[PDB]
Motif scaffolding. Structure first.
Motif, PDB file in Angstrom:
ATOM      1  N   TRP A   6       0.751  -1.116   0.067  1.00 58.63           N
ATOM      2  CA  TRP A   6      -0.057  -0.091  -0.056  1.00 58.63           C
ATOM      3  C   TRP A   6       0.820   1.096   0.123  1.00 58.63           C
ATOM      4  CZ3 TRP A   6      -4.354   2.369  -0.887  1.00 58.63           C
ATOM      5  CH2 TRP A   6      -4.540   3.711  -0.067  1.00 58.63           C
ATOM      6  N   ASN A   8       0.653   5.429   0.157  1.00 57.58           N
ATOM      7  CA  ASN A   8      -0.305   6.597   0.262  1.00 57.58           C
ATOM      8  C   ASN A   8       0.589   7.769   0.763  1.00 57.58           C
ATOM      9  OD1 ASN A   8      -2.353   8.414   0.839  1.00 57.58           O
ATOM     10  ND2 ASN A   8      -2.819   7.561   2.789  1.00 57.58           N
ATOM     11  N   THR A  10       1.458  12.091   0.116  1.00 57.87           N
ATOM     12  CA  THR A  10       1.004  13.418  -0.273  1.00 57.87           C
ATOM     13  C   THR A  10       2.332  14.286   0.175  1.00 57.87           C
ATOM     14  OG1 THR A  10      -0.499  15.326   0.188  1.00 57.87           O
ATOM     15  CG2 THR A  10      -0.271  13.587   1.840  1.00 57.87           C
ATOM     16  N   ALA A  18      -7.527   8.806   1.083  1.00 59.32           N
ATOM     17  CA  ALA A  18      -7.082   7.638   0.553  1.00 59.32           C
ATOM     18  C   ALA A  18      -7.501   6.486   1.627  1.00 59.32           C
ATOM     19  CB  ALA A  18      -5.634   7.175   0.405  1.00 59.32           C
ATOM     20  N   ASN A  20      -7.185   2.313   2.221  1.00 60.32           N
ATOM     21  CA  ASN A  20      -6.691   1.047   2.179  1.00 60.32           C
ATOM     22  C   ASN A  20      -7.806  -0.010   2.286  1.00 60.32           C
ATOM     23  OD1 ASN A  20      -5.259  -1.318   2.182  1.00 60.32           O
ATOM     24  ND2 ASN A  20      -3.789  -0.670   3.716  1.00 60.32           N
ATOM     25  N   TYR A  26      -8.726  -0.105  -3.451  1.00 63.38           N
ATOM     26  CA  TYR A  26      -8.768   0.990  -2.713  1.00 63.38           C
ATOM     27  C   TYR A  26      -9.447   2.148  -3.406  1.00 63.38           C
ATOM     28  CZ  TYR A  26      -5.515   2.614  -6.452  1.00 63.38           C
ATOM     29  OH  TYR A  26      -4.838   3.219  -7.532  1.00 63.38           O
ATOM     30  N   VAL A  28      -9.669   6.913  -3.593  1.00 57.18           N
ATOM     31  CA  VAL A  28      -8.976   8.082  -3.160  1.00 57.18           C
ATOM     32  C   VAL A  28      -9.840   9.216  -3.535  1.00 57.18           C
ATOM     33  CG1 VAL A  28      -6.953   9.218  -3.276  1.00 57.18           C
ATOM     34  CG2 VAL A  28      -7.136   7.032  -4.298  1.00 57.18           C
ATOM     35  N   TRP A  30      -9.743  13.505  -3.597  1.00 52.26           N
ATOM     36  CA  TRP A  30      -8.768  14.312  -3.474  1.00 52.26           C
ATOM     37  C   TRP A  30      -9.424  15.893  -3.795  1.00 52.26           C
ATOM     38  CZ3 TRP A  30      -8.593  10.790  -7.342  1.00 52.26           C
ATOM     39  CH2 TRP A  30      -8.127  11.358  -8.654  1.00 52.26           C
ATOM     40  N   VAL A  38      -1.065   7.528  -4.474  1.00 50.43           N
ATOM     41  CA  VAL A  38      -1.953   6.266  -3.721  1.00 50.43           C
ATOM     42  C   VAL A  38      -1.900   4.987  -4.566  1.00 50.43           C
ATOM     43  CG1 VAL A  38      -3.998   5.687  -2.629  1.00 50.43           C
ATOM     44  CG2 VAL A  38      -3.104   8.002  -2.522  1.00 50.43           C
TER      45      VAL A  38
END
Length: 185
Positions: A6, A8, A10, A18, A20, A26, A28, A30, A38
């Protein structure tokens, strides 16, 4: 034989929510981001792996990529197989083309660099790209036959290291908003 990694990350701009999810899934969401990545995949990439995914949601609102993303080491090289995007289709130094998985991809290189020294000395890390010529349809099962890209890259002098790091099917964004939901295997 399952996903086991995984990612993730930023740069801290805007909002990156995000999730998991369970197994290979998964999502996201944003908003007004800087850069972020991600994704789900594997702790050790393989040039032989066929990456499967099914993107139930691909909804960038601005600049985002739906892309295979991984690295090899010593020195660090990043690579991408970009199946879909938002406003901006990523390009770089054009090398040629490859056909894979029902799509035709343009091959590019770019470079990045580590923070320059006090004296302005720089160390680069290069990126290898395959970028689909048009956005791939989403919502059904898709394959990225990564070997075909590895081989085409080699034919253009774009050799990866024998030292494999992470390998993921990623959602990446830059200065944008959006949402995605992706299942990987």
């Amino acid at each position: 034989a399952s996903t086991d990694y995984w990612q993730n990350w930023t740069d801290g701009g805007g909002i990156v929510n995000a999730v998991n999810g369970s197994g290979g899934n998964y999502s996201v969401n944003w908003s007004n981001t800087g850069n972020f990545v991600v994704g789900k995949g594997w702790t050790t990439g393989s040039p032989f792996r066929t990456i499967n995914y099914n993107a139930g949601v691909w909804a960038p609102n601005g600049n985002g990529y739906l892309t295979l993303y991984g690295a090899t080491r010593s020195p660090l090289i990043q690579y991408y197989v970009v199946d879909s995007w938002g406003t901006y289709r990523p390009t770089g130094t054009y090398k040629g083309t490859v056909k894979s998985d029902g799509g035709t991809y343009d091959i590019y290189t770019t470079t990045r660099y580590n923070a320059p020294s006090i004296d302005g000395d720089r160390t680069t890390f290069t990126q290898y790209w395959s970028v689909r010529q048009s956005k791939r349809p989403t919502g059904s099962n898709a394959t990225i036959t990564f070997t075909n890209h590895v081989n085409a890259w080699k034919s253009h002098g774009m050799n990866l290291g024998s030292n494999w790091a992470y390998q993921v099917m990623a959602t990446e964004g830059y200065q944008s908003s959006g949402s995605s939901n992706v299942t990987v295997w």
